[model samples]
Target: NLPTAQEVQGLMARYIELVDVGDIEAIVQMYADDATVEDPFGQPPIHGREQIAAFSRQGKVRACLTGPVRASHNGCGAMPFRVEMVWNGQPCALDVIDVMRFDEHGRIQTMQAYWSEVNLS
Candidate 1:
């Protein structure tokens, strides 16, 4: 079953909300058991829920915006957005584009975050 564009956008909105709340438990539940997350584009991917959750908990997302989610019927999508957070007690704002692939159950199977210091400064 293919997901509608609205459904995909809703999923991303929910994800941003969870991130804003710093909900590691809920956020990890949004991913598949074997999900992989590649944040910052070139870093080694973080595999599995435990590691992903650990990585996610490092920063507090004070605010986030997906702007709009462009999605495919095959359950792949991308969201270009920005986030304001406090990581290591340093306030930072990041412009990011995240591409994701979803499993049949609508959980994210793979996620790649494209961003760098250039996007921050």
Candidate 2:
């Protein structure tokens, strides 16, 4: 059986919560071993769990949702959030949306973030 809508939503909620707390280890736990990530979209996709950890280590910041998680009936979800961080030596907040596809086991298989330079303010 596939993940129900509630389960997808639950994972999506937990994802942001862990991110807000800068718990990289816990965040990585949500990803599948062969997961891939493309932040800001259009860039190179990071492959594998260990590589994901390497990428996650770059950002230890606070994130809060601007809208509800739009989880599908299956194993996928999306949400928009604003992250507090310093960009190019200036304090800024980046408005971003992340779309995640989960594996059969409910672990995230792929995550693609939508955002660009203009989204940072």
Candidate 3:
């Protein structure tokens, strides 16, 4: 059977949470082994979990990315690549709506996000 809404939501929640916590291993596992990531700018996609893991590792600044909150998905897919957020009381919150596509094996094949940086004056 395909993954249920709750199951997908759970995965979505975990994906954001792990990202906020800077938990690379946990974050990478959320993707399918052969998953690919892409965003609006036609940025070069990150293929497979290993590539994703490596990218996450190179960005050593933790505070630059943290605290993902308020996530909801109406459609389908796996969460990947783009992590949208806002600075909140010295921490960041995910202002992005995550979109995903799932494969027959219950893994995320593709993920996309639509989030803009907030300019708090």
Candidate 4:
């Protein structure tokens, strides 16, 4: 059975908080062993927690939510977020909408971020 709406909402809230605090290990640890992430769509899927964690650690990230989080009972959630970081020593900002699907164990099964280079300006 899928999680309740409130449970999903709680998870989404915790995720945003973790990202806002730059807790890379805690955030990446929330994913299942076989989880995948494809940021900005079309790119090659990042497979497994180790690879994903490495991908995440490649940069220092700071995030803020621009809008309320929305979650559903189908193990899915979405949030409009803004990220500020230094990529390759250049400052960058991105407005992203992140959509996530969770497994029955409450670990993230997949995460897809919608953004573009335009948003990174």
TM of each candidate vs. truth:
0.88, 0.93, 0.62, 0.88
**lDDT per model, in order?**
0.81, 0.89, 0.58, 0.85
Q: What ranges in model 3 sit over 4 Å off?
A: 60-94, 116-121
Q: Identify the runs in model 4 with alpha carbons over 4 angstroms from their true place.
A: 86-91
Tens digits of per-residue lDDT for model 4 on 16-98? 88988888899898889999999778799999999988987775677888887788868888888889888789988889998
Q: To one decimal, what is the Cα RMSD in angstroms of model 2 from the true structure?
A: 1.4
Backbone clashes for every candidate come to 0, 0, 5, 0
Tens-digit per-residue lDDT, 15-42, candidate 3: 6567657888877777788988764324
Candidate 1 structure, TM-score to reference: 0.88
- Higher-ranked by TM-score: 1 or 2: 2
**Pick by lDDT: 2 or 3, better one:** 2
Cα miss at 67, model 3 (Å)?
A: 14
- RMSD vs true structure, all candidates: 2.0, 1.4, 5.9, 1.8
Write one digit per residue (lDDT tens) for candidate 1, span 1-121: 2556677777877887888787889999989889999987899889998898788776536557747788788878888788886667888788889888888788888899899989883
Candidate 2 residues lying further than 4 Å off, grouped into runs, are: none
Angstrom error at residue 73, model 3? 11
